[PDB]
Design a protein around this ligand. Structure first.
Ligand SMILES: NNNC[C@@H]1O[C@H](O[C@H]2O[C@H](CO)[C@@H](O)[C@H](O)[C@H]2O)[C@H](O)[C@@H](O)[C@@H]1O
Length: 434
């Protein structure tokens, strides 16, 4: 029958293809979900979607939107409110058995404009064979990296943060962790330097950025403007400390079985031969997962995101993907039905245990079966409960562009003057300037 297009980031394409295919089996020919890949960066994802929307591409049906785009797509009329579902089932489905943090990312003006499908929060990953105890705050991160450098051991702090949204996320986590905020609640005012407490928080976050940037054993690519990957930098053995989203777990094991991780030769374990399936995905038995995880645990561990202040946890910036229905769709009913299928319990378990992307269904974090294959579950749920949030505003694209331009390169940050420049650029963003 008809075709419901389903646009997702390229990196997650394969995963959302599998899910889509399963859902197609459940429809029996009534309609077919067809996954289509967007570019890698959130900015480019947004740009492709917005060009199709303003161009009235009537073949665009369902969008996997980054959490930071809701506001814009809601206020422009691009993402239909879930109340526009002709069946009237979308809102109740979206809230049922769904964690409140992601739900909050999917709303605008007290209405839901998308149904959360995946969420995200950054954890600390470390080499336990080189780091005796995972650092609990950023001062300890710095000290541990310096110690590793003084010993000829891999000394990088692999943070997914170049000159784009990753750097803004890093800064936002440090800022909210110190009690600060980019914008006011209503999104109408810049709150980086408007009070002494707010300015102090901003200055603390910037000092952490500058100190990490100028720690001996730093990756020489902090000024060399490229697009390196913290995941790969850790997998190649150049970093003993990484902060990144949980999918790196699924990466480690998988690439370790493929022979791509030098310090973790899971490819040399006979019991794991053939655990990579015919399309390149690590799909172990229960026994094979036990073997792989046990071997991994000697050189690969995880821990909470490092706090900025000793004594209490960090407040970690939430990310993820919400399923929105395009205003361009010719088939609202089928599009919302597809959304409901793509986020069901089976497909949530799949998106986590095979795609590595944290699920939004609360039940799964209370599911021992799920917990056995997703060992980061407790820290993830805890950080999702106390999550930091990037400001929700229709001008988020320009705001993030300007903030990243000020923050980069982090080696040239001067906390006081940089705080003032961040405030000025954020004010330009919310004033209407991009
Ligand atoms: N760190 N900020 N950069 C983008 C964000 O990271 C996340 O999205 C990106 O990383 C995940 C990996 O789990 C991919 O699935 C996404 O496709 C990729 O864009 C996060 O979920 C986003 O909200 C952030 O903006």
């Amino acid at each position: 029958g008809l075709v419901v297009s389903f646009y997702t980031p390229a990196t997650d394409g394969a995963t959302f293809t599998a899910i889509a295919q399963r859902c197609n089996q459940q429809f029996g020919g009534r309609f077919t979900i067809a996954q289509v890949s967007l570019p890698r960066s959130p900015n480019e994802q947004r740009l492709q979607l917005a060009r199709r929307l303003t161009g009235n591409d009537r073949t665009l049906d369902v969008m996997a939107l980054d959490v930071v785009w809701t506001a814009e797509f809601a206020e422009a009329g691009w993402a239909l409110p879930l109340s526009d579902d002709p069946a009237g089932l979308a809102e109740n489905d979206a809230v049922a058995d769904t964690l409140p943090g992601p739900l909050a990312t999917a709303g605008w003006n007290h209405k839901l404009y998308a149904a959360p499908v995946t969420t995200n929060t950054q954890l600390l990953w470390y080499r336990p064979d080189l780091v005796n105890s995972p650092p609990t705050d950023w001062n300890a991160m710095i000290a541990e990296a310096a110690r590793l450098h003084a010993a000829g051991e891999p000394s990088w702090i692999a943070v997914q943060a170049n000159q784009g949204e990753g750097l803004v996320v890093w800064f936002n986590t440090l800022l909210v962790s110190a009690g600060g905020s980019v914008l006011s609640e209503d999104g109408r005012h810049v709150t980086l330097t408007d009070t002494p407490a707010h300015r102090a928080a901003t200055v603390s976050a910037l000092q952490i950025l500058k100190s990490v940037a100028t720690t001996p054993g730093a990756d020489p690519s902090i000024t060399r403007t490229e697009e390196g990957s913290a995941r790969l930098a850790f997998e190649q053995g150049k970093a003993a400390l990484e902060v990144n989203w949980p999918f790196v777990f699924a990466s480690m094991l998988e690439n370790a079985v493929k022979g791509g991780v030098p310090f973790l030769p899971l490819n040399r374990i006979p019991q794991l031969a053939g655990s990579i399936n015919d399309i390149g995905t690590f799909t172990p038995s229960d026994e094979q997962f036990r073997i792989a995880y046990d071997a991994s645990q000697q050189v690969f561990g995880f821990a909470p995101y490092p706090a900025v202040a000793p004594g209490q946890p960090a407040k970690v910036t939430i990310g993820g993907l919400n399923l929105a229905v395009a205003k361009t769709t010719r088939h609202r009913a089928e599009a919302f039905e597809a959304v409901r299928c793509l986020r069901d319990q089976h497909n949530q378990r799949y998106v986590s245990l095979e795609g590595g992307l944290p699920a939004v269904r609360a039940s799964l974090y209370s599911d021992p079966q799920f917990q056995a294959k997703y060992p980061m579950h407790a820290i993830i749920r805890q950080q999702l409960t106390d999550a930091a949030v990037r400001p929700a505003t229709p001008v988020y694209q320009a705001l993030s562009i300007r903030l990243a331009a000020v923050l980069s390169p982090i080696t040239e940050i001067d906390p006081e003057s940089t705080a003032d420049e961040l405030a000025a650029q954020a004010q330009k963003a919310i004033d209407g300037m991009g």
